Amino acid sequence: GIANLKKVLSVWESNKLTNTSEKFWQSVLKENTWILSQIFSNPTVLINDEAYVVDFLYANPFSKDAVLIAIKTPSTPLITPTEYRTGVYSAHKDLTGAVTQVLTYKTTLQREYQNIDYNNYRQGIKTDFDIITPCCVVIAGMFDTLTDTAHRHSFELYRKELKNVTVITFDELFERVKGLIKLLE
Amino acid sequence: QDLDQLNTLIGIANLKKVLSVWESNKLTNTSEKFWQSVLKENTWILSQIFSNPTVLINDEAYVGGKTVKNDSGKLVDFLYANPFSKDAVLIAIKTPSTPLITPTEYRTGVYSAHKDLTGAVTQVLTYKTTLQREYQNIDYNNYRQGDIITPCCVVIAGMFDTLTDTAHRHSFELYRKELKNVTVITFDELFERVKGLIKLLE
Amino acid sequence: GIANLKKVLSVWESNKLTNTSEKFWQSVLKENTWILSQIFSNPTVLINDEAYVLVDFLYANPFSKDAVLIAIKTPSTPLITPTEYRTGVYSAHKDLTGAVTQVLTYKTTLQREYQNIDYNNYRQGIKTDFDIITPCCVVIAGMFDTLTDTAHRHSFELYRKELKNVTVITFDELFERVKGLIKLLE
Amino acid sequence: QDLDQLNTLIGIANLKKVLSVWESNKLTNTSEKFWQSVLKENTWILSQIFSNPTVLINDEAYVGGKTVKNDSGKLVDFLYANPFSKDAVLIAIKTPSTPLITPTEYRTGVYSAHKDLTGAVTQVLTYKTTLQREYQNIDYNNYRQGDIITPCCVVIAGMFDTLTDTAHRHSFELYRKELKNVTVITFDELFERVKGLIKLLE
């Protein structure tokens, strides 16, 4: 119950600034599928990797629409160390490259959907995800690393101009988990 | 930790009653006022679903599922008073028997959004603009004597049961996934996540 | 030159309130490919219908090969519903909303069947200069002049700014660029 | 008739003059000021390319390719004075040698945007916010004594000649097409449409 929710936070806090392996955070969200389900207002269910043979695929159980989620490490920089202009900071190449990569996978997944769908038919797997819209999510970095107001302003501009990619930092992801505790109390 | 178990039961008990009314009058009772009242009393559910501590329903504001009483009676006055609620979610609750797509076909395999559904999306944006100007008007007066809210908009109308076709569901998704600042979630989708919360708590 | 530009407006000014056939407006834009190329700041070139096979045009950037799908309706296509949802609130007409859904559906199909389309061009010997990299769509329908009341314009502006990947452009706005080009030169 | 032919020749002569400058030192001159000066004396070209009669380069405003003489020296003053010029396109002109993507690969087939390119995109957005803030500042003062400009942003930098692979071109497109209020057009793309205008006229 709620003790399970607190356990997730304890795991999150313990490796908040130490773990730098994408595989570990892959497991944590895979073990607790409800964590990523809180991002989307519409209901979502996890899709097994075999169905579409460090990303996750969540699909709406009603419309079968699928959303692709890419998970990086919390230590991923959000902005460049130096500043392009006084008070203007460029988004780090790690963040910009991550956004591009998830779009490429979404393009590839839709372009090869017929091959994947037919393979599931042969193997008996029931395909429950339909690529209707190019919605992607990139979970990376921590918002707390942005100290200066210029840093927060520069990063906020980057994450507001994106059309179909929602960049969510790790701390914001677990704030929904932590926020659930407060609402229950 | 014992109270945490008590909180778990209290949270589940509230969720069961919300599903109880939904699974009892989702077909007969179709008045907008009734469904607004039900979701008002269970605002804490909406806070988690839309990932926003502060929500705006009708002419009232609820923070963390708590009714924030405002003596002035103006939603804008509360929003200006508290800078925290500058990213609140505006929710318009319609009847669950609201058509989502036109019964006929615009083309082969394409269904256009129904009048009622796209009317609500226009209405909430109109309501959002009015709140923005009233907030701006107060800011001008305070400056005269001596920002912009930009709240999120969410429309809750219709059920996914009426979409009894792949074309019906695909057309609806292409509509609601194209809006920038409006999220359309059906009543069936709304209460199915309520079931998910029960499963997570249990 | 300029005389050519004024000739195009003569056709537009003559058929904007008379011609209600979708095929005719396809012919006009197909004859003058430069008209639709003025919508996009980046260079674009029209792709023949044989290459990638409702009126639909396909323009591709000559450099990055990115393709854009444009759907053309009639100028007589309503933009908003005749009645009002609420007092001062008008809904977008089903013709406009349905047109947006259809162009997105065709864009989805075009990307999904790209491998077959690319392979067919290889067999037929045709080159494939278009690539579906981004889901960008354009819908051309109706005229902005038909929105007389300030509520009508506000209701339509809310809808068109709300869209993510579809840019609804009325006919008069499209041909205003043609008229705008004349004034800049003159 | 006679006037049209004279205007057609003037337009073609102007367009060919710009191409002569572009094709004479696109590989030698890297001064950002130089390319700002060249592209601001031919603003009528930019008006048609970006489909906007009003163009804002640096702190100077151009309407229909004509230099507006604002004696105040503040760009916002002109914008507030003239309600017509509210959707003006803000254009930032960089050197054509500006890199577009990182020379190394982020992954297998994925390239991230270069620091200079993404730095300019943030800079114009910062410039846009300052103009919006100053526009309100004037508007607030007028109210005390007795809306929102929300313009567009365009960045012109780099050449497509650097992108010598399919992966490079796909990566660049996935970046600029994802932006909402910023349009990125390379110098090679900018003058390609200049050639297209000549073909249309001639």
Beta-carbon contacts of residue C137 (< 8 Å; ≥ 6 apart): C68, C69, C70, C71, C100, C103, C104, C107, C165, C166, C167
- For residue B177, the distance in angstroms to the closest alpha carbon of chain C comes to 9
- Among D10, D84, D189, most C C-beta atoms within 10 A, so best to mutate, is D189
Long-range contacts of the stretch D57-66 (C-beta < 8 A, 24+): D57/D91, D57/D93, D61/D85, D61/D88, D64/C183, D64/C184, D65/C184
The torsion defined by the Cα of B93, B96, B97 and B103, in degrees rounded to 10, comes to 90
Tell the burial category of B155 from Cβ atoms under 10 Å away from its Cβ (0-12, 13-18, 19+): buried
3-class state of residue B69 by DSSP: coil
Resolution (A): 2.8
Can you read off the two tokens belonging to residue C170? 């009325």
Q: How many domains does chain C have?
A: 1
Neighbours of D128 (CB within 10 A): 20
Neighbours of D2 (CB within 10 A): 6
Partnered with residue A68 across adjacent β-strands are: A57, A136
Asked if C95 and C75 touch (Cβ cutoff 8 Å), the reply is no
| Residue among C166, C182, C179, C171 at smallest CA distance from C26 | C171
- For residue B46, the distance in angstroms to the closest alpha carbon of chain A comes to 9
Gap between the Cα atoms of A176 and A139, Å rounded: 14
| Residue among D153, D199, D189, D167 at smallest CA distance from D16 | D199
Neighbours of D91 (CB within 10 A): 26
Gap between the Cα atoms of A58 and A39, Å rounded: 11
Gap between the Cα atoms of D202 and D199, Å rounded: 5
Partnered with residue B61 across adjacent β-strands are: B56
C-alpha atoms less than 13 angstroms from C-alpha of B193 in its C-beta half-sphere: 22
**Please, what sign has the CA dihedral across residues A91, A94, A99, A103?**
positive
Q: How many CB pairs under 8 A join B and C?
A: 86
Gap between the Cα atoms of D202 and D200, Å rounded: 6
Smallest Cβ–Cβ distance between A34 and the set B11, B160, B200 belongs to: B200
Residue D123 lies in a domain: yes
- Among B117, B122, B155, most C C-beta atoms within 10 A, so best to mutate, is B122
User: What is the side-by-side strand order in the sheet with A165-168?
Assistant: A45-46, A55-59, A66-71, A136-139, A165-168
Gap between the Cα atoms of A168 and A140, Å rounded: 7
The separation between CA C96 and the C-alpha centre of its own chain, rounded to angstroms, equals 12
Gap between the Cα atoms of B110 and B168, Å rounded: 8
Phi-psi map region of A166: left, alpha, beta (phi>0 left; psi -120 to 50 alpha): beta
C-alpha distance from residue B98 to each of A17, A69, B42, B168, C87 (Å):
48, 32, 22, 15, 19
DSSP H helices, C16-149, are 22-31, 34-37, 49-52, 94-112, 114-124
| Residue among B157, B9, B5 at smallest CA distance from B91 | B157
Beta-carbon contacts of residue A24 (< 8 Å; ≥ 6 apart): A15
Scanning every residue of chain D, which has its alpha carbon at the shortest distance from the alpha carbon of A154? D122
Q: Count Cβ neighbours within 10 Å for each residue of A75-95 and write b for 16 or more, e otherwise.
A: bbebbbeebbeeebbbbbbbb
The torsion defined by the Cα of C179, C183, D1 and D5, in degrees rounded to 10, comes to -120
Asked if C155 and C91 touch (Cβ cutoff 8 Å), the reply is yes
- For residue B47, the distance in angstroms to the closest alpha carbon of chain D comes to 28
Q: Strand D89-93 and strand D54-57: pairing?
A: parallel
Gap between the Cα atoms of D157 and D95, Å rounded: 6
Can you read off the two tokens belonging to residue A18? 């130490």
Asked if D176 and D118 touch (Cβ cutoff 8 Å), the reply is no
| Residue among D176, A164, A106 at smallest CA distance from B178 | A164
The torsion defined by the Cα of D161, C134, D181 and D42, in degrees rounded to 10, comes to 40
Q: In chain A, after which residues does the backbone break, taking C–N over 2.5 angstroms as a break? A: 53
Can you read off the two tokens belonging to residue B156? 């809750």
C-alpha distance from residue A73 to each of A24, C76, D175, D185 (Å):
9, 54, 22, 33
Residue B178: which domain range?
30-188
Interhelix angle D2-25/D32-40, nearest 10 degrees: 170
Beta-carbon contacts of residue A93 (< 8 Å; ≥ 6 apart): A80, D102, D106, D112, D113, D115
Cβ separation of A114 and C112 shorter than 8 Å?
Answer: yes
Asked if D80 and D135 touch (Cβ cutoff 8 Å), the reply is yes
Can you read off the two tokens belonging to residue D194? 């200049």
Strands (E), chain C: 45-46, 56-60, 67-72, 137-140, 166-169
Cβ separation of A99 and D178 shorter than 8 Å?
Answer: yes
Can you read off the two tokens belonging to residue B184? 């359309």
Asked if D66 and D53 touch (Cβ cutoff 8 Å), the reply is no
Q: Scanning the structure block, which residue is given the tokens 């050449």?
A: D159
Scanning every residue of chain B, which has its alpha carbon at the shortest distance from the alpha carbon of D146? B144
Scanning every residue of chain B, which has its alpha carbon at the shortest distance from the alpha carbon of A172? B51
Cβ separation of A107 and C165 shorter than 8 Å?
Answer: no
The overall longest dimension of chain B from CA atoms, in Å, is: 61
Amino acid at site D96: P
Asked if A58 and A46 touch (Cβ cutoff 8 Å), the reply is yes
| Residue among A52, A50, A44 at smallest CA distance from A113 | A52
C-alpha distance from residue C37 to each of A77, C138, D174 (Å):
40, 12, 21
3-class state of residue C149 by DSSP: coil
| Residue among C99, C81, C120, C89 at smallest CA distance from C170 | C99
Residue B170 lies in a domain: yes
Can you read off the two tokens belonging to residue A31? 């073990």
**Please, what sign has the CA dihedral across residues A150, A156, A161, A164?**
positive
C-alpha atoms less than 13 angstroms from C-alpha of B17 in its C-beta half-sphere: 10
The separation between CA A83 and the C-alpha centre of its own chain, rounded to angstroms, equals 27
Cβ separation of A107 and C111 shorter than 8 Å?
Answer: yes
Which H helix or E strand runs over B60?
Answer: strand B60-63
Asked if C145 and C123 touch (Cβ cutoff 8 Å), the reply is no
The overall longest dimension of chain A from CA atoms, in Å, is: 59
Q: Count Cβ neighbours within 10 Å for each residue of D133-161 and write b for 16 or more, e otherwise.
A: ebbbeebeeeeeeeeebebbbbbbbbbbe
- How long, in residues, is chain D? 202
Which H helix or E strand runs over B32?
Answer: helix B32-41
Q: Scanning the structure block, which residue is given the tokens 């916010």?
A: D129
Q: What angle do CA A46, A52, A56 make, to 5 degrees?
A: 40
Gap between the Cα atoms of C37 and C178, Å rounded: 11
| Residue among D14, D190, D181 at smallest CA distance from D94 | D190
Tell the burial category of B142 from Cβ atoms under 10 Å away from its Cβ (0-12, 13-18, 19+): exposed
Asked if A102 and A138 touch (Cβ cutoff 8 Å), the reply is yes
Residue B156 lies in a domain: yes
Asked if D180 and D119 touch (Cβ cutoff 8 Å), the reply is no
Asked if B70 and B78 touch (Cβ cutoff 8 Å), the reply is yes
Beta-carbon contacts of residue D166 (< 8 Å; ≥ 6 apart): none
Terminal Cα distance for chain B, rounded: 16
The torsion defined by the Cα of B188, B193, B194 and B199, in degrees rounded to 10, comes to 130
Interhelix angle B2-25/B187-201, nearest 10 degrees: 150
Gap between the Cα atoms of A174 and A35, Å rounded: 8
Neighbours of A119 (CB within 10 A): 16
SS3 content of chain C, % helix, strand, coil (to 5): 50, 15, 35
- For residue D194, the distance in angstroms to the closest alpha carbon of chain B comes to 34
Amino acid at site C132: I
H, E, C per residue of chain A: CHHHHHHHHHHHHHCCCCCCCHHHHHHHHHHCCHHHHCCCCCCCEECCHHHHCCEEEEECCCCCEEEEEEECCCCCCCECCCCCECCECCECHHHHHHHHHHHHHHHHHHHCHHHHHHHHHHHCCCCCCECCCCCEEEECCCHHHCCCHHHHHHHHHHHHHECCEEEECHHHHHHHHHHHHHHHC
| Residue among C136, B193, C131, C112 at smallest CA distance from A130 | C112
CA-only gyration radius of chain A, Å:
18
Gap between the Cα atoms of C16 and C25, Å rounded: 10
Q: What is the DSSP letter of C158?
A: H
The separation between CA D101 and the C-alpha centre of its own chain, rounded to angstroms, equals 20
Which H helix or E strand runs over C148?
Answer: none
Scanning every residue of chain A, which has its alpha carbon at the shortest distance from the alpha carbon of B175? A133
Smallest Cβ–Cβ distance between C86 and the set B123, B170, B179 belongs to: B123
Smallest Cβ–Cβ distance between B170 and the set A34, A43, A132 belongs to: A132
Gap between the Cα atoms of B191 and B182, Å rounded: 19
Q: Count Cβ neighbours within 10 Å for each residue of D113-125 and write b for 16 or more, e otherwise.
A: bbbbbbbbbbbbb
Q: What is the DSSP letter of C52?
A: H
Neighbours of B112 (CB within 10 A): 26
Q: In chain B, after which residues does the backbone break, taking C–N over 2.5 angstroms as a break? A: 146
| Residue among C77, C70, C138, C90 at smallest CA distance from B106 | C77
- For residue B191, the distance in angstroms to the closest alpha carbon of chain C comes to 27
Interhelix angle D115-145/B115-145, nearest 10 degrees: 60
Q: What angle do CA D94, D98, D100 make, to 5 degrees?
A: 120
3-class state of residue B112 by DSSP: coil
H, E, C per residue of chain D: CHHHHHHHHHHHHHHHHHHHHHHHHCCCCCCHHHHHHHHHCCHHHHHHHCCCCEEEECCEEEECCEECCCCCCCHHHHHHHCCCCCCCEEEEECCCCCCCECCCCCECCECCECHHHHHHHHHHHHHHHHHHHHHHHHHHHHHHHCCCCCCEEEEECCCCCCCCCHHHHHHHHHHHCCECCEEEECHHHHHHHHHHHHHHHC
